[PDB]
Amino acid sequence: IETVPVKLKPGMDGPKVKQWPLTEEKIKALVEICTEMEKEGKISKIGPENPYNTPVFAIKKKDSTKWRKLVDFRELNKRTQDFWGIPHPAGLKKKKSVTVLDVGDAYFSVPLDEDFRKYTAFTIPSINNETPGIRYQYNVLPQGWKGSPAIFQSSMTKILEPFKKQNPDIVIYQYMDDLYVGSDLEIGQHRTKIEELRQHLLRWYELHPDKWTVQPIVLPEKDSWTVNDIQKLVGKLNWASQIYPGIKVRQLSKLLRGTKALTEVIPLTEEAELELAENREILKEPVHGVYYDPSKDLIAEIQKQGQGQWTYQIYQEPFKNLKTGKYARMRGAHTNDVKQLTEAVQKITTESIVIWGKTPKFKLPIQKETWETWWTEYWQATWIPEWEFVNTPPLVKLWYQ
Q: Which of 238, 316, 321, 324 binds another protein (CB under 8 A)?
A: 238
Residue 254's SS3 state is: helix
Annotated binding site: 102, 177-178
Residues within window 211-230 making contact with another protein, judged by CB under 8 A: 226-228
Considering only the stretches 20-28, 73-81, 93-101, 156-164, report the one whose residues sit in contact with another protein under the rule CB under 8 A.
20-28
62 binds another protein (CB under 8 A): no
**Containing H/E element for 179?**
strand 178-183
Closest to another protein by CB, 49 vs 63, is 49
Q: How far is the CB of 294 from another protein (least distance, A)?
A: 31
Longest Cα pair distance anywhere in the chain, in angstroms?
81
Burial of 278 (C-beta count, 10 Å sphere; 0-12/13-18/19+): middle
Contacts of 315 (CB under 8 A, 6+ apart): 298, 299, 301, 321, 322, 323
231 binds another protein (CB under 8 A): yes
Amino acid at residue number 276: L
79 binds another protein (CB under 8 A): no
Q: How far is the CB of 12 from another protein (least distance, A)?
A: 12
323 forms beta bridges with 314
Of 105, 115, 132, residue with least CA distance to 42: 105
Q: Which of 41, 91, 267, 306 binds another protein (CB under 8 A)?
A: 306
Considering only the stretches 14-22, 86-94, 139-147, 154-162, report the one whose residues sit in contact with another protein under the rule CB under 8 A.
14-22
CA dihedral 129, 132, 138, 144 (to 10 degrees): 30
392 binds another protein (CB under 8 A): yes
Measured N-to-C along each axis, helices 153-166 and 187-202 cross at an angle, to the nearest 10 degrees, of 130
Considering only the stretches 79-87, 162-170, 289-297, 299-307, report the one whose residues sit in contact with another protein under the rule CB under 8 A.
299-307
10 binds another protein (CB under 8 A): no
> Is the CA virtual torsion 68, 72, 77, 79 positive or negative?
negative
Residue 216 sits at the vertex; the CA angle it makes with 212 and 218, to the nearest 5 degrees, is 130
Q: How far is the CB of 65 from another protein (least distance, A)?
A: 20
| Cα 367 to Cα 361: distance, rounded to the nearest angstrom | 16
39 binds another protein (CB under 8 A): no
Report yes or no: 366 and 391 within 8 Å, Cβ to Cβ.
no
250 binds another protein (CB under 8 A): yes
Residues within window 350-379 making contact with another protein, judged by CB under 8 A: 364-367, 369-371, 373-374
308 binds another protein (CB under 8 A): no
CA 363 to chain centre: 12
Closest to another protein by CB, 23 vs 157, is 23
| Site track for another protein across 261-280, x = CB under 8 A | xxxx----------------
Q: What is the total count of residues that contact another protein (CB under 8 A)?
A: 64
Residues making up the chain, counted from first to last = 401
257 binds another protein (CB under 8 A): yes
Q: Which of 5, 10, 47, 245 binds another protein (CB under 8 A)?
A: 47
44 binds another protein (CB under 8 A): no
Give the end-to-end CA distance of the chain in Å, rounded to a whole number.
54
Residues within window 93-132 making contact with another protein, judged by CB under 8 A: 127-132
Report yes or no: 253 and 234 within 8 Å, Cβ to Cβ.
yes
Q: How far is the CB of 38 from another protein (least distance, A)?
A: 14
Q: How far is the CB of 304 from another protein (least distance, A)?
A: 6
For 96-118, b/e burial (b = at least 16 CB within 10 A) is ebbbbbbbbebbbebbbeeebbe
Residues of this chain that interact with another protein (CB under 8 A) are 16, 18, 21-24, 27, 47-51, 53, 127-132, 135, 226-228, 231-232, 234-235, 238, 249-250, 253-264, 303-304, 306, 336-341, 364-367, 369-371, 373-374, 392-393, 395, 397
